[PDB]
UniProtKB/Swiss-Prot annotation, chain A:
This is Spike protein S1. Binds to host ACE2. RBD also interacts with the N-linked glycan on 'Asn-90' of ACE2. Cleavage of S generates a polybasic C-terminal sequence on S1 that binds to host Neuropilin-1 (NRP1) and Neuropilin-2 (NRP2) receptors. Interacts with host integrin alpha-5/beta-1 (ITGA5:ITGB1) and with ACE2 in complex with integrin alpha-5/beta-1 (ITGA5:ITGB1). May interact via cytoplasmic c-terminus with M protein. May interact (via N-terminus) with host bilirubin and biliverdin, thereby preventing antibody binding to the SARS-CoV-2 spike NTD via an allosteric mechanism. It comes from Severe acute respiratory syndrome coronavirus 2. It comes from the Viruses. Attaches the virion to the cell membrane by interacting with host receptor, initiating the infection. The major receptor is host ACE2. When S2/S2' has been cleaved, binding to the receptor triggers direct fusion at the cell membrane. When S2/S2' has not been cleaved, binding to the receptor results in internalization of the virus by endocytosis using host TFRC and GRM2 and leading to fusion of the virion membrane with the host endosomal membrane. Alternatively, may use NRP1/NRP2 and integrin as entry receptors. The chain holds residues 348 to 397 of 1273 of the full protein.
Length: 50, 47
């Protein structure tokens, strides 16, 4: 999307793989705030919004 | 310690950092005391 009207997808009712995302060489930056990208695999959430 | 990696993965070479280089290949101590020195070598190492 254009940033004036960004996409937003609720993620829910599913099993994540923040490990395969954090290990993807695609990303120029992966900066995390209030969480560390490793711990996302052991911590978990009521919902996630992308 | 001396080695080659793809430049964007230099980001992983720190105490407390992680990913396929920093976990699956070469891990620093999380109290590491030392200097990390890195540079682009495209002129020599690419073909």
């Amino acid at each position: 999307a254009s940033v004036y009207a960004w996409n937003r997808k609720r993620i829910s009712n599913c099993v994540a793989d923040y490990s395969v995302l954090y290990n993807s060489a695609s990303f120029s930056t992966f900066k995390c705030y209030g969480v560390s990208p490793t711990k996302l695999n052991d911590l978990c959430f009521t919902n996630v919004y992308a | 310690d001396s080695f080659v990696i793809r430049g964007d993965e230099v980001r992983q070479i720190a105490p407390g950092q992680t990913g396929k280089i920093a976990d699956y290949n070469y891990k620093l101590p999380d109290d590491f005391t030392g200097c990390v020195i890195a540079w682009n070598s495209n002129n020599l190492d690419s073909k």
